[PDB]
Amino acid sequence: GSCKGRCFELQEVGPPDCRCDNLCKSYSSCCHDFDELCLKTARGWECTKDRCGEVRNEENACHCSEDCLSRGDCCTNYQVVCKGESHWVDDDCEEIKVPECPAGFVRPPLIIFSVDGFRASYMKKGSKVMPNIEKLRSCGTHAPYMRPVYPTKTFPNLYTLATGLYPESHGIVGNSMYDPVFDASFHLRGREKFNHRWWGGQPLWITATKQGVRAGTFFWSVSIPHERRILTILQWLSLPDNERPSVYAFYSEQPDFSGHKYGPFGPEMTNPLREIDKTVGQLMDGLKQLRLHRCVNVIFVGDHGMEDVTCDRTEFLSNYLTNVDDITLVPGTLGRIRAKSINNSKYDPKTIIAALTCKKPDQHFKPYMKQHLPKRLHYANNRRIEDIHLLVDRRWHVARKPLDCFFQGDHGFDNKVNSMQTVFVGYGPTFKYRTKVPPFENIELYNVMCDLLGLKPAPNNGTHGSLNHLLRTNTFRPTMPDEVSRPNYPGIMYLQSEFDLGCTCDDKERHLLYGRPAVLYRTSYDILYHTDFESGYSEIFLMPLWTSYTISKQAEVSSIPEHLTNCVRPDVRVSPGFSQNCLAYKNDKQMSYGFLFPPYLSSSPEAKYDAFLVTNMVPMYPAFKRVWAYFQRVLVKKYASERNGVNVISGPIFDYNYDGLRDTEDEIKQYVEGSSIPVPTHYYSIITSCLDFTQPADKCDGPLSVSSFILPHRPDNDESCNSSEDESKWVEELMKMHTARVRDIEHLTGLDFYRKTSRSYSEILTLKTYLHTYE
Ligand SMILES: CC(C)CCC[C@@H](C)[C@H]1CC[C@H]2[C@@H]3[C@H](O)C=C4C[C@@H](O)CC[C@]4(C)[C@H]3CC[C@]12C
Ligand SMILES: *[C@@H]1O[C@H](CO)[C@@H](O[C@@H]2O[C@H](CO)[C@@H](O)[C@H](O)[C@H]2NC(C)=O)[C@H](O)[C@H]1NC(C)=O
Ligand SMILES: CCCCCn1cc(-c2cc(=O)c3c(O)cc(O)cc3o2)c2ccccc21
Ligand SMILES: [Ca+2]
Ligand SMILES: [Ca+2]
Ligand SMILES: [Zn+2]
C-alpha cells in the first residue's frame, strides 16, 4: 500500500499489491505515496557548493551528502561541484579498448537513449548546442544518418528498433490501426495500446530476459521528468549483480514536440536540442561518477526526422471522391482508406483509386494498392494495412474534408526522404573509436544490440553481420548460404526442327563479374552462355531467374534490325518442353514479351541473334515494355557512361502474396493464356561497378558500387501521370521510386549474389543492404 523504498523497483507484479513501477501512472495503479516519495523535486537536480556535505534530507530530489554514492542517489554533478571532478564532456576522448567495469559485471551494460524526431541534420545545427552529444559522436561510432522504416511514425519505428522487424511483421504498422480479426482499433492515445495482442515479434527486452539477461523498463511515464529517468537508470546500475539489469532505455519526447510546432529548422529548435544535451551530460556525468563511463555502451538513436509541413498544404479527398462520407481515412503524411462498411454500398476499391489518380496537375499524393507500393517499403503483408494507400508528397498532408496553423512540422513520409532521416551514435567499449560508418537502416540495430549483449537474436529482417563494421569486438561471424540447387550446364541437345513453339524469326568471365548467383531453393536451372551475357534459365518458370551481362563505358547502342523485330529463335540447348511458346503471346492479347539481355547492346550483328533466343524472353505488358525498352536502350549505356562500365543482373520476381518472399509455383496467380508460363509481379536489375570510378568495372580491385531496382510489372502506366510524355520525362523517375536493396531482391528471388568477390563477406553484406536513395 506504500512506495517506501519501493520507488522504481523492477518487480513484476500482477494484481494486486499496488504499484510503484516506472509505468504505474499510465496504468493508474500507483500506490498513493508514489508522487511524494517517488516523484521528488525539492531543490532541483544539480548539486550546489552549499549543498556539499549536507545532512541527508530524504525529501530532496537528489542528494549531495557523503552517503549519496553509497546510496547511489547523488545528483549527477556531485563530484564536479563537491569533489572537484571534471565534467565528462570537458575530458579528452580516450579510447576504450577493453570494458573497464566493476567486478561482478558479467556483461558490458547497454543503454539506449532514444529521441523523438531527431533529424540527422540537427547534428551539425548544434555542434555548440550539443557538446556532450558531439563528443559521443566524434569519439564513438556514428553514421551520417539512419534510415527509419515506413511509416516514419514513432511507434512503428520504436518497435522496429526493438525487434529488427518491418512494421508489417511486428504489427505496429502505424500509430493508428484497425485490426479486422480483433474488430478493434489501436491509437497512440488510449489503453488499447497496452494490450499485448497488438505487439508481435520479439522485442529486445524479451529476447534478453528469455536468455537470462535482466532488463530495465524501456518505457517511462510522461509524468516522470527526464532528469528523474536519468537518476533511476543510474540507480539501477548501482544494484547488486543479482538485481542489476544489463540493458536500459531512456526516451525523450523531444525534439519531435518542438519540431512539430515551430518547424524543423526554426531558431526555436536550439533550446530543445540543448535540453537534450544536458540530459546526455547528466547521464555521462552520472556514469563517470559511478566510474561506469568506460564500461557502458551507449546508443544515441532517433525514430525519424521532421519536415516542414503546414495545414495550408493539404489535399482533400472530397475534391477527388464523390462519397467521402462512405470512407475511413487515416490522414496526414500517409493515407489509408478503408470502407465505413456501414452505409457503404457505393464503396468500390477500383472506382476509389481511379478517382484519386492523376486528377490534378500538381497532385501532392498518389493512390496505391498496397501490393503496388514500392517494395523497399515492405508495407503490405499485414491485415492491419488497408489495401488503399496514399503516398503523400513531402511537406504535404492529406485529409478527408477541408474541415479537418497549429503545426509547422510533421513526419511519416516515405523513408527515403532526407527530412525523415534520423541519427545513430554508438559510444562504449564494444564500439569503434573515432570511427565512421555508412548510413544504415534501423532494422539492423536489433542484431547489433543482441551482439552487444551476447544475445541470440530472434528471427528478424536485419542482415546479421551487415553492421559488424560498427564494432571493435562482440564479433558475429557471417557464413555464406549454401547452394541448394546446383546448375546443369546443357549442350546442343535438340534440333531446330524438333521445336514447334509457334516462334518465328527471319534468322538466316567478363559478364559474370561477381560469381554465379546461388540458387537457394530446390529447382532445376541451366546456366546458358552467350557472347554478350550469361543466364540461369529456370526450366520450371520457363524463363531466366538471373541474366548477367557487362556493358563497358565505350559500348555502342544499336537498333533492333527491322527483319528481327518480331524474331524469337529456339534455343537448341533447352527442351521444347522447358521453353515458352510464341503462340501463347499471340493468344494473350494483353500480354507481350521482352528480353532480359537487351538486343540494343549486342556486341555484333551476329551476336544480337542470341538476344532473340526464346530463353531470353519474358512476359511483358505493352505498358511495361515502354519502361523496360527505355531502361534497356537508354539508361544502361547511360549508367555505363557515368560509372565506367556496369555489370547488370536482370530478372523476374514473383510475389503475388506481397510477402516480399519468392513465390512458389502454387503462389503464382497469373499465367499467359493457355500457357504454363508465369507472369512476374516485378522485374529486377542489379547494376554494379567500381566505387573507384577510375577503374573499369571488369578490373576493379576494391569496394563495389551498386544500384538496384524492383520495377512493378503493371498492365498500365497510371502510376506515371507523365506517362504520356516521352520516356525522357518519366521512366527514370519511376525507376527511382522503386530503388531496391540487393538484399530485397535476394528475398524476392531466392538468389544469393556476390559470392565470388575480393571483398569480405561482412563488406558484401553491407553492400547488399545499401539502398541508393537518389535524394
Ligand atoms: C502510455 C505510454 C507512456 C507508455 C506505452 C507503453 C506500451 C507501448 C508498452 C508498455 C509495456 C509493453 C509490453 C511489455 O514490454 C511486454 C511485451 C511482451 C512482448 O512479447 C511483446 C511486446 C510487449 C507486449 C510490450 C508491448 C509495448 C508495451 C505494451
Ligand atoms: C522478416 O522476418 C520475419 C521473421 O522470420 C519473416 O517471416 C518469417 O519467414 C520465415 C521464412 O520464410 C517463415 O518460416 C516464418 O513463418 C515467417 N514468420 C512467421 C511468423 O511465420 C519475414 O519473411 C521477413 N521479411 C522479409 C521481407 O524478409
Ligand atoms: C531496442 C529497442 C529500443 C526502443 C525503445 N522504445 C521506447 C518507447 C517509448 C517509451 C516512452 O516512455 C514513451 C512516452 O513516455 C510517451 C510516448 O508518446 C511514447 C513512448 O515510447 C517504445 C515504444 C515501442 C517500442 C519500443 C520503444
Ligand atoms: Ca536486411
Ligand atoms: Ca511471395
Ligand atoms: Zn516519434
Q: Are residues 666 and 590 in the same domain?
A: yes
For this entry, resolution in Å reads 2.5
Examine the domain organization and report whether 297 and 320 are in the same domain.
no
- For residue 352, which phi and psi values (nearest 5 degrees)? -60, -55
Q: Is residue 546 helix, strand or coil?
A: strand
Ligand 2: which of 661, 682, 747, 751 to mutate, most ligand atoms within 8 Å of CB? 661
The string of DSSP codes covering 237-263 is TTS-TTT--SEEEEEEEEEHHHHHHH-
C-alpha span between 359 and 357 (Å, rounded):
6
Amino acid at 725: E
Spell out the residues 6+ positions from residue 442 whose beta carbon is closer than 8 angstroms to its own: 146, 147, 148, 149, 157, 160, 161, 301, 303, 422, 424
Q: Is residue 124 part of a domain?
A: yes
Cell of 376: 523497399
Evaluate: CB of 194 within 6 angstroms of ligand 1. yes
Say how far apart CA 327 and CA 401 lie, in whole Å: 11
Distances from the Cα of 236 to the Cαs of 252, 425, 502, 578, 703, in angstroms? 19, 23, 76, 66, 45
Residue 418 burial by CB count (10 A; 0-12/13-18/19+): exposed, middle or buried?
A: middle
Q: Do 595 and 653 fall within a single domain?
A: yes
**How far, in Å, is the centroid of ligand 1 from the Cα of 196?**
7
CA 296 and chain centroid, separation? 27
Report yes or no on 696 lying in a domain.
yes
Cell matching residue 52:
556539499
**With contact defined as beta carbons under 8 Å apart, do 748 and 662 qualify?**
yes
Q: What's the distance, CA 456 to chain centroid?
A: 21
DSSP label of 295: T
Give the total residue count for the chain.
775
Shared domain check, 380 and 238: no
How far is residue 771's CA from residue 709's CA, in Å, rounded to a whole number? Answer: 9
269 falls within a domain: yes
State the structure-solving technique: X-ray
Q: What is the DSSP string of 579-606?
A: S--HHHHHH-SS-EEEESS-GGG-SSTT
Confirm whether 489 is domain-assigned.
Answer: no
Q: What are phi and psi of 135, to 5 degrees?
A: -70, -40
The CA–CA distances, whole Å, from 203 to 158, 207, 381, 386 equal: 10, 6, 20, 25
Half-sphere exposure of 721 (CA within 13 A, CB side): 13
Helices (H) and strands (E) in the chain, counts: 19, 29
- 411 annotated to a ligand binding site: yes
Pocket test for ligand 3, best of 251, 297, 451, 453 (most atoms within 8 A of CB): 251
Q: Is the dihedral of CA 216, 220, 224, 227 positive or negative?
A: positive
Tell whether 741 and 725 lie within a shared domain: yes
Q: Are residues 159 and 246 in the same domain?
A: yes
Nearest-CA residue for atom 8 of ligand 2 = 459
Sign of CA dihedral 143, 149, 154, 155: negative
Instruction: Characterize the bridge pairing of strands 297-302 and 307-308.
Output: unpaired
Q: Among 477, 511, 526, which residue terminates a domain?
A: 477
In a domain, 7, yes or no: no
Residue 322 is among the residues annotated as catalytic for this protein? no
Residues 613 and 650 in one domain: yes
Using DSSP's 3-state secondary structure scheme, residue 548 falls into strand
Q: In this structure, is residue 408 part of a structural domain? A: yes
Centre of ligand 6 from the C-alpha of residue 303, in Å? 6
Mark whether 580 and 658 lie in a shared domain: yes
Taking the C-alpha atoms of residue 168 and residue 187, their distance in angstroms, rounded to an integer, is 17
The Cα-based distances of 565 to 271, 506, 612, 726 in angstroms read 67, 9, 9, 21
Tell me: is residue 663 an annotated ligand-binding position. Answer: yes
| 551 in the same domain as 436 | no
Q: Which helix (H) or strand (E) holds 168?
A: helix 167-170
Domain that holds residue 392: 314-413
CATH number for the domain spanning 738: value is 3.40.570.10
Closest residue by CA, ligand 2 atom 11: 661
Q: Residue 527, SS3? A: strand
Query: Where residue 409 sits, what CATH number does that domain have?
Result: 3.30.1360.180
Following DSSP, what letter does each residue of 376-438 receive, concatenated?
GG---SSTTS-SEEEEEPTT-EEESSTT----SEE----TTSGGG-B-EEEESTTBPSSEE--
Cell of residue 652, nine digits = 523476374
Return d(Cα 174, Cα 43) in angstroms, integer: 41
- Ligand 6 centre to CA of 335 (Å) is 18
639 plus 650 within the same structural domain: yes
Q: Are 173 and 157 in contact (CB under 8 A)?
A: no
Residue with C-alpha cell 503524411?
333
**φ and ψ at residue 437, rounded to 5 degrees:** -135, 155
CATH of the domain at 253: 3.40.720.10
Mutation to probe ligand 1, out of 186, 219, 222, 226 (largest number of atoms < 8 A from CB): 219
Same domain, 292 and 326: no
Give domain status of residue 591, yes or no: yes
Q: Give the domain-ending residue among 413, 428, 463.
A: 413
d(CA 374, CA 772): 14
> CB of 424 closer than 6 A to ligand 1?
no
134, 515, 642 from 125: Cα distances, Å = 11, 45, 34
Distance 411 CA to ligand 1 centre (A): 23
Same domain, 547 and 507: yes
Residue ranges near ligand 6 (ion) with Cβ within 5 Å: 116, 154, 256, 303
Within a domain: residue 72?
no
Q: How many structural domains is the chain composed of? A: 3
